[PDB]
């Protein structure tokens, strides 16, 4: 129940999968981000923890062409670099 405020690019990402608010729980931020990635089918078929985000708004937010969903800290770090504070 800590609410965070996505900076504009993160917000745009959330809004492309139906997000309506200015603020969000982290669980919400991940929810939408998870949906975007399933939706756009960005995960690797065989190795489904691999996400290819080069050439995508998600790539702009993250600053990498790919990442593993096992790199928990890395992912939360990207998000937390993209919050109004």
């Amino acid at each position: 129940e800590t609410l965070v405020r996505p900076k504009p690019e993160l917000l745009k990402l959330l809004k492309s999968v139906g997000a309506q608010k200015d603020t969000y729980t982290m669980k919400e931020v991940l929810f939408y981000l998870g949906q975007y990635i399933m939706t756009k089918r960005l995960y690797d078929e065989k190795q489904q923890h691999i996400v290819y985000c080069s050439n995508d708004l998600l790539g702009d937010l993250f600053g990498v062409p790919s990442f593993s969903v096992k790199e928990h800290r890395k992912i939360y770090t990207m998000i937390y670099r993209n919050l109004v504070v």
Binding site: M26, V29, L30, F31, G34, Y43, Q48, V69, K70, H72
Partner: peptide, 14 residues
């Protein structure tokens, strides 16, 4: 799918 269960893991930290 496998991606949903790696991602579900991710949500436990939040």
């Amino acid at each position: 799918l496998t991606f949903e269960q790696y991602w579900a893991q991710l949500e436990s930290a939040a």
